[PDB]
Swiss-Prot record:
Domain notes: Contains 1 copy of a cytoplasmic motif that is referred to as the immunoreceptor tyrosine-based inhibitor motif (ITIM). The phosphorylated ITIM motif can bind the SH2 domain of several SH2-containing phosphatases.
Description of post-translational modifications: N-glycosylated.
Domain Ig-like C2-type: 4-96, 103-187
Boundaries of the shown chain within the full protein: 142 to 333 of 417
Biological function: Mediates NK cell adhesion and triggers NK cell effector functions. Binds two different NK cell receptors: CD96 and CD226. These interactions accumulates at the cell-cell contact site, leading to the formation of a mature immunological synapse between NK cell and target cell. This may trigger adhesion and secretion of lytic granules and IFN-gamma and activate cytotoxicity of activated NK cells. May also promote NK cell-target cell modular exchange, and PVR transfer to the NK cell. (Microbial infection) Acts as a receptor for poliovirus. May play a role in axonal transport of poliovirus, by targeting virion-PVR-containing endocytic vesicles to the microtubular network through interaction with DYNLT1. This interaction would drive the virus-containing vesicle to the axonal retrograde transport.
Similarity annotation: Belongs to the nectin family.
MF term (GO), any: virus receptor activity
Protein name per its UniProtKB record: Poliovirus receptor
Listed GO biological process terms: heterophilic cell-cell adhesion via plasma membrane cell adhesion molecules; homophilic cell adhesion via plasma membrane adhesion molecules; natural killer cell mediated cytotoxicity; negative regulation of natural killer cell mediated cytotoxicity; positive regulation of natural killer cell mediated cytotoxicity; positive regulation of natural killer cell mediated cytotoxicity directed against tumor cell target; susceptibility to natural killer cell mediated cytotoxicity; susceptibility to T cell mediated cytotoxicity
Disulfide bonds: C25-C80, C125-C171
Naturally occurring in which organism (per UniProt): Homo sapiens
The keyword Secreted belongs to this UniProt entry's keyword annotation: yes
Length: 192
């Protein structure tokens, strides 16, 4: 028998409809051939294959992990387990998935309890994409931003109001692949 060594890269992927290979794992020069299995919180479909090795009697196994690409998987871990009767213990190889996609946006920092004459409250335009977003843009459903709302990069500062107002905000985010956007209505009364 022969002790074979192995590798594993990460096959970068876009947002195609079909299930494509997102991670490869390979054990070259096995005798006998090695056993390759995958383990992770988000299992899919592993497709294995093998070609003759270098020294007569050996075999190199090449297994790829196929899955239907999706935004929440970017950054997640996938582990390949190469087990063979010649190692001290089953060897473990881990890859760091990668998926490019348009920006998914949302706005936080608003508790329906906004009243007249309060202190400066600021909202953040939460956005998760790959690769990182290149530009942020604030505007209103009416066109230009009201005078009490001054834009600050990826955040919008809301100053004190003298009289009640209404305005649905829009955060247009642009990264290297596209440009998306969120919506959001905000109110300020008097009450107590
Ligand atoms: C901010 O807007 C509110 C109302 O907000 C409401 O929802 C928004 C998304 C828009 O669709 C608005 O058009 C809509 O009003 C203003 O106060 C609202 O005024 C309207 C009419 O002036 C009130 O209509 C009432 O409807 C109820 C039943 O739904 C009837 O019982 C009443 O008789 C009356 O017809 C509406 O009730 C009232 N909304 C609230 C929550 O009180 C508000 O004036 C505006 N801000 C400022 C500073 O003017
Ligand atoms: C897979 O690898 C990627 C990058 O190779 C990892 O992304 C990295 O995520 C960490 C934490 O989530 C980021 O580190 C933090 O950076 C900020 C700087 O903004 C710093 O303030 C923090 O103290 C911390 O160091 C890191 O920026 C980010 N890498 C890149 C290139 O953006 C990802 O976590 C890996 N995924 C898994 C499942 O291991
Ligand atoms: C694993 O993938 C291989 C190819 O990587 C599949 O082989 C294909 O087989 C289909 C029919 O089943 C053929 O139409 C293709 O030409 C083959 N593709 C290649 C690249 O050879 C194989 O079917 C897959 N294994 C399993 C068990 O599904
Ligand atoms: C995801 O994979 C990374 C490696 O890319 C893991 O990082 C290891 O963390 C352990 C314990 O924290 C360390 O002993 C190792 O040194 C780290 N690996 C490297 C190469 O530095 C991480 O544990 C994994 N996390 C998840 C959630 O899967
Ligand atoms: C968002 O910003 C991009 C970049 O300039 C622009 O082309 C696009 O028209 C904007 N989208 C909307 C809905 O305003």
């Amino acid at each position: 028998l022969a002790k074979p060594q192995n590798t594993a890269e990460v096959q970068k992927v876009q947002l195609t409809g079909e299930p494509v290979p997102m991670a490869r794992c390979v054990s070259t020069g096995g005798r006998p051939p090695a056993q390759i299995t995958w383990h992770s919180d988000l299992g899919g479909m592993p497709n294995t294959s093998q070609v003759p090795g270098f020294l007569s009697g050996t075999v190199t196994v090449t297994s790829l992990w196929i899955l239907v690409p999706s935004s929440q998987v970017d950054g997640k871990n996938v582990t390949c387990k190469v087990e063979h009767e010649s190692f001290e213990k089953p060897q473990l190889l881990t890859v760091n998935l990668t998926v490019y996609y348009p920006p998914e946006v949302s706005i936080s920092g608003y508790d329906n309890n906004w009243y007249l004459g309060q202190n400066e409250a600021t909202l953040t335009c939460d956005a998760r994409s790959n690769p990182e977003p290149t530009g942020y843009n604030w505007s209103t459903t009416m066109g230009p931003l009201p005078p009490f709302a001054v834009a600050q990069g990826a955040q919008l500062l809301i100053r004190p109001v003298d009289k009640p107002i209404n305005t649905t905000l829009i955060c247009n985010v642009t990264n290297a692949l596209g440009a998306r956007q969120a919506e959001l209505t905000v109110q300020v009364k008097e009450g107590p």
